[PDB]
Amino acid sequence: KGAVGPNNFIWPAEDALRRGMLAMASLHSKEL
Amino acid sequence: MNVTPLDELQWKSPEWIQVFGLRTENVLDYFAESPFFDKTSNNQVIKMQRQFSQLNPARRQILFKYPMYMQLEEELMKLDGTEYVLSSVREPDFWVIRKQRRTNNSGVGSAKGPEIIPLQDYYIIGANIYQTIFKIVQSRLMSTSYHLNSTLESLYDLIEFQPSQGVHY
Amino acid sequence: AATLQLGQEFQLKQINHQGEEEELIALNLSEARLVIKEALVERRRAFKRSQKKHKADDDDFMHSETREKELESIDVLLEQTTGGNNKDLKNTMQYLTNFSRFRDQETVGAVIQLLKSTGLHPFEVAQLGSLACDTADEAKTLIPSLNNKISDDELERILKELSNLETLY
Amino acid sequence: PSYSPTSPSYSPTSPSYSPTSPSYS
Amino acid sequence: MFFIKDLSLNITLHPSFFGPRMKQYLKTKLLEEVEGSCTGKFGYILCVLDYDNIDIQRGRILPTDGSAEFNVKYRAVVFKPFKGEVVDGTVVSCSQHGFEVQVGPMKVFVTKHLMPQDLTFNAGSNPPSYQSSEDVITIKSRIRVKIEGCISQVSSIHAIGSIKEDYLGAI
Amino acid sequence: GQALDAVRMRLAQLTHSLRRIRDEMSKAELPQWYTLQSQLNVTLSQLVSVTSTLQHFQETLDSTVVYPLPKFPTTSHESLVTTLLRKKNIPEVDEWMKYVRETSGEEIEKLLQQDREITNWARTTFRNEYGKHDFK
């Protein structure tokens, strides 16, 4: 429980969404 | 420009806890990058001094438990001003720091040591950070009063009067 | 009862008709007045029920706008429940009404809770509920039992809180 | 003594309104 | 001082009331005779609780006159002071010898020898009163009196109190 | 501690009065109007006393510093701790005064002094009007 293992959670990880390209896509929504 | 009060301000650093993890050894290291850590505090000055040198009830318990805390006094007694010190720790999830400022009044006639004065409250709960109860009480009371006003105006709207009976519903 | 000499007839431990020991019960002006008013209105309601058996308005009596209206309701209650043959009861009820420190039941309960939270003697508690003292020493001198038994800070806090609790007329 | 204690009026169902914003590094 | 006590009384019912409604007559007799009375053993009889819960005992016809005597027990709120008691009260009458204070249903008198000399009698005032540097005591003025003694008769109890020490007078 | 103790007892009695008015409003049948007025006035004046006493002792409340117990476990009661910790207002009151300020919207200072003089003038005018007619 205390060891945050990557890419294996029951629920979607907040850090996964932060590192996901959707974050920069929203940041670069003007470029879209 | 609208500013969120720092008392309710809550910082989360998933990358830091993923890389280093939560521990009393690096709790100050975790706090360093937060907005609450003032860059003008003498702790940062001590940090650059250490970096340059390398390149070139429970208060007494936590006092005697750790040697880095010792090094914190012997590096902090020389510099007076705003400094960050640990308040208490219960593992493996709860840490609180003690936000105090020091004025080493070495004047003649004062037999006391350096003056220590509180400035703020900071609570590290899990990976989150929390920072007046008077405001809480007044806010709760005023919202209660607003709801009471709404209820009473609605009830008075429901009220109907006749001279021959009095007031009825 | 300067030295708490209550005698056999008024011992702290009372033997009831059930044979079990009970704490002696003392009521101040407010508690006694409320109890006697409740008993009188209950007796009036029982009398009305009996009369209806042989053969709404009661809510206005307990809730009084003013002292004079309360006294008028008291006179009507005595006329309809006592018969006017008992002048001593009328005098006692008038003395209770004129010098009742507290009119509302909730405030009287607050006073009782404040006075008996410390666990003082029922005599002292009833005396404090009857007497309003500005300073702790004034109460201590006027109540010799309270001497040596309650700290002055606690007595001052209790007296100030009781004075604040008094409902404005 | 104490005429009656207060009934527990806890509201855990209250969602709270803590503002969260300084999460990005 | 208000207290709750257990009381009993012997009541004689006349033979002419011997019918199915005897309990009602006993209740009326009890209420009409007991309430408002004064007994030196228990002070003034102020009120009786739980009127519907009146306890009764079987009759015992007296051998001389035929009146049935009953023993009735109940719980009552009564008033009685003690030596050294301090009570607030209302000034009734003003005199040169002292004053009289009504407390509850009783009267406590204080003689001029029992107050400090700072309180001086003013007769020209309307009404005449006692005036001092700080405290003024007159009709309808709340006054604290330390009761020193009580005299008990069949129908009443008189009291004598003193205010000779400090923290006494007007509140 | 004395000031916070008085605040505690007064707020406790205020909460008791709130519980009262609650369990006499929760009945399916509405009582008489007069009892409702009495309860309203008593509870509302009690709220006034709460406000005044909280005003009186601001310094004692401010001086106090909040700290969790060493014996209190946060691992199991972190939800309870966060429940009392949070202080942000309910949103509806927030946009309420936001729309209020939107509607309201050296110049401000001289309007302020003009309001001062209007207030003083109105007070004096009504004192004169009261003195004009004998009300005793």
**Structural method:** cryo-EM
DSSP E96-163: SSEEEEEETTEEEEEEGGGS-TTSEEESSSSS-EEE-SS-EE-TT-EEEEEEEEEEE-SS-EEEEEE-
Half-sphere exposure of B96 (CA within 13 A, CB side): 19
Q: Using CB atoms, pick whichever of F30, F50, F75 lies closest to residue B93.
A: F75
Partner F, chain C 46-75, Cβ-Cβ below 8 Å: 56, 59-60, 63
DSSP chain B: -----TTS-----HHHHHHT-S-SSSHHHHHHTSTTS-TTSHHHHHHHHHHHHHH--HHHHHHHH-HHHHHHHHHHSSS-SEEEEEEEEETTTEEEEEEEEEE----TT--S--EEEEEEEEEEETTEEE--HHHHHHHHHHHHHHHHHHHHHHHHHH-EEETTTEEE-
- For residues F136 and F120, what is the distance between their CA atoms, to the nearest angstrom? 26
- Cross-chain Cβ contact C59/F31 below 8 Å: yes
Class of residue E7 by CB neighbours under 10 A (exposed 0-12, middle 13-18, buried 19+): middle
Query: Do E83 and E149 form a contact (C-beta atoms < 8 A)?
Result: yes
Closest residue on chain A to B14 (Cα) = A15
- What is the DSSP code (8-state) at residue C145? G
Residue E45 and residue E109 share a domain: no
Residues of A with CB under 8 A from a CB of B: 2, 4, 6, 14-15, 18
Interface probe with B: pick from D14, D17, D20, most Cβ of B within 10 Å: D20
- Cross-chain Cβ contact D20/B4 below 8 Å: no
Chains E and D touching, counted as 3 or more CB pairs less than 8 Å apart:
no
Question: Is D18 in the B-facing interface, judged by CB distances under 8 Å?
Answer: yes
Q: How far is D13 from chain B (nearest CA, A)?
A: 16
Residue E103 and residue E169 share a domain: yes
Residue E77 and residue E54 share a domain: yes
Residue E130 and residue E114 share a domain: yes
Residue E25 and residue E65 share a domain: yes
Q: What is the number of domains present in chain E?
A: 2
User: Domain C27-51+66-169 is classified in which CATH homologous superfamily?
Assistant: RNA Polymerase II, Rpb4 subunit (1.20.1250.40)
Half-sphere exposure of C160 (CA within 13 A, CB side): 13
- Cross-chain Cβ contact C116/D4 below 8 Å: no
- Cross-chain Cβ contact D17/F88 below 8 Å: yes
Q: Using CB atoms, pick whichever of D18, D23, D25 lies closest to residue B8.
A: D18
> In C, which residues are within 8 Å of E41 by CB distance?
9
Query: Please, what is the Cα angle at C158 between C94 and C131, to 5 degrees?
Result: 25
Closest residue on chain B to A19 (Cα) = B15
Name the residue among E45, E143, E43 with its Cα closest to residue E86.
Answer: E143
Q: What range does the domain containing E115 cover?
A: 85-171
Question: Is F38 in the C-facing interface, judged by CB distances under 8 Å?
Answer: yes
> In F, which residues are within 8 Å of C165 by CB distance?
13
Helix (H, G, I), strand (E, B) or coil at F74: helix
- For residues C65 and C71, what is the distance between their CA atoms, to the nearest angstrom? 11
> In F, which residues are within 8 Å of C60 by CB distance?
34
Question: Is C97 in the E-facing interface, judged by CB distances under 8 Å?
Answer: no
> In F, which residues are within 8 Å of C107 by CB distance?
13
Q: Using CB atoms, pick whichever of D6, D9, D18 lies closest to residue F86.
A: D18
Residue E3 and residue E80 share a domain: yes
Q: How far is B24 from chain F (nearest CA, A)?
A: 16
Q: How far is B45 from chain F (nearest CA, A)?
A: 28
Q: Which of E57, E84, E111 is the last residue of a domain?
A: E84
Query: Please, what is the Cα angle at C8 between C6 and C11, to 5 degrees?
Result: 60
Q: How far is F82 from chain B (nearest CA, A)?
A: 10
Residue E126 and residue E46 share a domain: no
Cα-based distances in Å from C137 to B103, C131, F5: 42, 13, 21
Neighbours of F, requiring at least 3 CB pairs below 8 Å, are: B, C, D
- For residues E13 and E69, what is the distance between their CA atoms, to the nearest angstrom? 6
Closest residue on chain D to F89 (Cα) = D17
Question: Is C110 in the F-facing interface, judged by CB distances under 8 Å?
Answer: yes
Q: Which of E84, E115, E131 is the last residue of a domain?
A: E84
Q: In what order do the strands lie in the sheet with E120-122?
A: E120-122, E129-131, E136-137
Chains F and D touching, counted as 3 or more CB pairs less than 8 Å apart:
yes
Cis amide prior to F68 (ω within 30 degrees) = no
- Cross-chain Cβ contact A14/B15 below 8 Å: no
Residue E134 and residue E59 share a domain: no
- What is the DSSP code (8-state) at residue E67? P
What are the structure tokens assigned to C113, written together? 């809770």
Question: Is B2 in the D-facing interface, judged by CB distances under 8 Å?
Answer: no
CATH number of the domain that residue E104 is part of? 2.40.50.140
Residue E94 and residue E28 share a domain: no
Question: Is F37 in the B-facing interface, judged by CB distances under 8 Å?
Answer: no
Closest residue on chain F to D17 (Cα) = F88
Kindly state the greatest CA–CA separation across chain F: 73
- Cross-chain Cβ contact B4/D19 below 8 Å: yes
Residue type, E66: G
- For residues B20 and E26, what is the distance between their CA atoms, to the nearest angstrom? 90
Rg of chain B on CA atoms, in Å: 26
Query: Do B131 and B103 form a contact (C-beta atoms < 8 A)?
Result: no
- For residues E92 and E109, what is the distance between their CA atoms, to the nearest angstrom? 10
Q: How far is A6 from chain D (nearest CA, A)?
A: 19
CA dihedral sign, ordered C90, C94, C97, C99: negative
CATH number of the domain that residue E76 is part of? 3.30.1490.120
Residue E74 and residue E91 share a domain: no
Cis amide prior to C144 (ω within 30 degrees) = no
The b-or-e profile of C137-163 (16+ CB within 10 A means b, else e) is ebbbbbbebbeeebeeeebbbbbebbe
Neighbours of E, requiring at least 3 CB pairs below 8 Å, are: C
Q: Which of E84, E117, E133 is the last residue of a domain?
A: E84
Chains C and A touching, counted as 3 or more CB pairs less than 8 Å apart:
no
Query: Do C2 and E85 form a contact (C-beta atoms < 8 A)?
Result: yes
